[PDB]
Structures are given as C-alpha cells and as structure tokens.
C-alpha cells in the first residue's frame with residue numbers, strides 16, 4: 045500500500061506521499077471546465093477503498109481505508125484488530141479487514157461528530173510531527189481517550205492535505221521548521237467548504253464559471269475572501285480534487 | 292436545483308484592478324462600458340444567466356461590431372435572442388462566441404473605453420468575474436520548498452528560503468492575471484522582452500502578454516499567450532534564474548504553490 049513512515053518523514057517524502065495519494069484517488073476521475081478532477085461516484089463496494097499505511101516511530105503500523113468517493117476514512121486496521129466508523133458504508137466490513145477482529149467506533153467520521161465525542165475541536169488540536177507520530181500510536185493501541193483527537197490530526201494531515209494544496213503547504217512548513225500549529229480560519233474554511241466548493245464549481249458550468257452561491261475562504265490574515273466563481277487562484281490552484289455533485 | 296443556478300449577480304474586475312462599468316449608468320442601447328474604480332454602484336453589477344448573457348441595468352453586455360476596435364456596450368437583450376452570447380474561458384478570457392472578439396482594455400491607460408479586440412492573451416484581456424475584486428496577497432512556493440522573491444531593487448526574481456513576513460517574498464495577484472510586487476504594485480512579473488533571453492524578470496506593468504499568468508490546476512504558472520510556463524532554470528534553485536519554458540514532466544521546476 046502507499047505508505048509513509050516516521051523514520052523517513054521529511055518535507056520531500058511527505059510531499060511525494062500526498063502527490064501519490066491524490067493520484068490514486070483520482071484514477072478514473074471526471075473533469076470539467078475548471079480542470080480539477082472530480083472523484084468517482086457509484087463505485088462498487090468491492091472497489092471503493094484505498095488502503096494506505098502509516099508507521100510510527102516504534103515501527104508500529106496502521107492501515108487506513110479511504111473511501112474513494114469522498115476522500116474520508118471509513119476504518120482502519122492495527123495488527124489483528126480493525127475499527128469502523130458508525131457511518132462507514134454498511135457493507136464495508138465484508139470487504140475490508142475481513143481477517144481481523146472488527147469493532148465499531150461509537151461515532152461518525154465527520155469532524156462534527158469526532159469533536160463532540162472527544163470534547164476537543166480542531167482549533168485546539170495541535171498538528172505537526174509529534175502529533176502525527178502520536179496519532180498513529182494512539183490509533184495502533186486504540187487508546188480510547190486519544191482516538192478522536194488522533195483522527196482530527198490524521199484526517200487533516202493526510203486527507204485534508206490531499207484535498208488542498210494550502211493545507212499540504214502548512215504541514216510542509218511544520219515539518220521543515222519542526223514547528224507545530226493549530227489550524228486557523230484559512231485552513232478550517234477550506235475543510236468546511238470542500239463539498240460546497242465541489243457543488244459550486246460543477247454547477248458553474250452552466251453559468252460561465254460563476255457560482256450559485258458565494259463561499260467564504262479566509263486568508264492567513266483572517267480576512268474572508270468571497271469566492272463566487274472559479275476565477276480565484278486561492279481555489280483553482282489549491283483544491284486538488286472535488287466530490288462528485290452534478291450530472 | 293443547486294446544480295442549475297438561475298442567475299448570479301457579481302462584479303467584473305480586470306486591468307489594474309478596475310471594474311467593468313456602464314459609464315454614467317446610462318441605459319440607452321449602445322451605452323458604452325469602461326473601466327472605473329470598483330464600487331457598489333448598480334452600473335458595476337453584472338448578472339449572469341444560463342443563456343450566456345451578462346447583464347447590467349437590465350441590459351446586455353455586447354460587442355458593437357464584427358471587426359476589432361469598437362466599443363463594448365449594453366443593449367436590449369431582445370436583440371440578442373438569436374445570439375450565442377459570451378463564453379468565458381477558464382483563464383478569464385471573455386469572448387463573443389460568434390465573432391471571437393474578446394473584452395479588452397486596450398489603451399496605454401486602463402482609464403479607458405472597453406472594446407472587442409482580437410485575442411492575444413494580453414493581461415489587458417484578462418478578467419476576474421467575482422464580487423471580491425481586490426488583489427490577493429500571497430507567497431509563491433516553488434522548487435525545494437522555496438519562495439519567489441523580488442530582487443535587485445525590484446528588477447529580478449528568483450527563489451530564496453521562505454521567511455515569514457519578508458516583504459519581498461509577497462506578491463499581489465491581480466484581476467488581470469498579473470503577479471505584482473506587493474509593496475510596489477506598479478511592477479509586474481514579466482516574461483522576457485528580449486528574444487535572446489528566456490529569463491523572467493520584473494518590469495513596469497503594461498498590460499502585455501508577457502505579464503499575464505495563469506495558476507493552473509495542474510500546478511503550473513502559465514503564460515497562455517506564449518504557450519509556456521514558469522520554470523526553475525536547469526531545476527537548480529542556486530542559479531537564481533526563473534525562465535519561461537514549454538511544459539514538460541521532467542523535473543519538479545514547473546510546479547508551484549500559492550500560499551496565502
């Protein structure tokens with residue numbers, strides 16, 4: 045499986061990992077005027093998951109299953125154990141990690157659900173090297189008190205980074221300078237609006253690239269920039285792929 | 292249904308960050324459109340519809356001649372019933388589908404009449420349709436995770452290690468597809484004007500093809516008129532040279548990131 049290990053975790057290897065993850069998720073994608081790939085849809089369950097391995101500093105590895113339709117995690121495996129989100133596709137357990145002791149986590153793979161269960165928000169959850177490593181560990185041993193924040197960390201450092209070059213870049217900075225950070229409005233506004241941007245971009249085909257609704261994306265100075273068309277570089281050179289939304 | 296928006300009102304900004312404006316808010320058929328400082332006035336509000344019309348004050352933006360050089364105006368939409376309309380490219384070119392002329396601010400000053408001209412991919416033919424018309428301040432990251440920096444008293448540009456808040460590493464992305472020195476917005480990143488050199492440099496903004504850059508989804512900084520992209524000379528950041536090259540998959544020098 046595509047993988048990343050803490051024993052070789054540099055800006056270059058992280059970048060390559062993210063690049064490859066995007067490539068894999070975009071196999072068979074569709075394209076519109078914007079030229080931003082649109083993830084597959086109506087994918088048969090036997091093919092709906094992309095597995096990626098992450099190894100911590102202890103040579104302990106977890107395998108995460110990513111739904112290729114939405115670039116979200118559905119479950120993961122650690123040794124002979126597996127854990128599925130409540131909202132994982134109902135038939136997933138028959139397709140992935142079948143030869144393990146399967147468990148269902150009492151929460152959904154969404155930030156909202158994870159933050160409620162863990163009692164901690166993304167704004168208050170540090171990201172960086174230490175956190176990536178620790179998150180893999182917490183998931184490997186399934187320490188319940190740290191599972192929710194571990195997903196907040198990994199979802200953002202892996203999946204949201206795949207979705208947005210801006211987020212990938214934040215993580216790169218964190219690795220290069222070994223400086224941890226918490227996401228600010230700029231990063232959170234992207235995560236929040238991925239599906240909405242996907243819908244507007246696709247819908248804009250009928251309106252000369254203009255959106256039906258404006259989306260507020262914040263900059264690093266905490267200023268909101270209204271993105272009401274495809275003509276903003278902060279969108280078109282940033283969002284790497286989209287969720288399928290329109291015929 | 293959300294996949295089929297029926298309309299959207301927005302502004303249109305371009306050269307030097309000015310807005311497309313129906314001069315004096317006049318409504319007579321043939322009333323000309325110009326560039327003027329952006330504001331909230333109705334004569335700067337353009338409504339887009341699925342019929343390929345772009346309207347202000349209830350009338351339609353349109354060219355006024357088949358040949359180049361005539362004004363763009365607003366006119367009764369009923370006169371365009373049997374017309375294909377406008378098509379906007381992913382890079383911000385606004386083109387009359389039938390004639391192929393494109394919206395242009397052609398004069399030596401942007402305080403000018405807009406006309407329908409032959410497309411040459413000039414910055415003066417690049418537009419940002421959208422309500423947020425301001426330049427976008429950003430850093431531009433390239434090879435070796437370095438940042439483009441304005442050097443030699445704002446005459447050259449090359450990569451240097453990123454330093455937060457280092458003034459010369461900030462760029463202002465304008466509505467006309469120019470990349471401007473953040474603290475001297477009269478200066479633009481420009482492809483070479485000397486055929487003997489492929490070196491990208493910084494020059495006074497002039498609306499030219501040399502100064503129009505498109506940040507593509509594939510990660511390149513493209514000069515559409517010249518069918519080329521920004522590249523790190525020999526894939527070596529230490530050469531302190533950024534050049535215009537045909538797009539190629541060899542090396543990573545043609546990949547960039549916008550970090551705002």
Ligand SMILES: *[C@@H]1O[C@H](CO)[C@@H](O[C@@H]2O[C@H](CO)[C@@H](O)[C@H](O)[C@H]2NC(C)=O)[C@H](O)[C@H]1NC(C)=O
Nearest residue numbers: 352353354356357370371374376377387389390
């Ligand atoms: C696009 O350009 C075409 C061609 O110049 C314009 O079509 C002319 O429209 C006027 C009014 O409809 C008529 O007098 C002419 O007979 C048309 N000429 C031709 C050659 O077709 C059209 O109006 C333009 N549309 C826009 C939106 O700019």
Ligand SMILES: *[C@@H]1O[C@H](CO)[C@@H](O)[C@H](O[C@@H]2O[C@@H](C)[C@@H](O)[C@@H](O)[C@@H]2O)[C@H]1NC(C)=O
Nearest residue numbers: 321322323324325361362398402403404405
């Ligand atoms: C913008 O459009 C108008 C209306 O079509 C033109 O008359 C303007 O031409 C200018 O004014 C005329 C009277 C003449 O002096 C001509 O040489 C000028 O260029 C045109 N230009 C401007 C700047 O208003």
Ligand SMILES: *[C@@H]1O[C@H](CO)[C@@H](O)[C@H](O)[C@H]1NC(C)=O
Nearest residue numbers: 130131150151152153156157
């Ligand atoms: C989780 O997801 C499902 C939607 O797929 C929803 O019905 C449910 O309300 C959510 N549950 C929690 C625990 O929030």
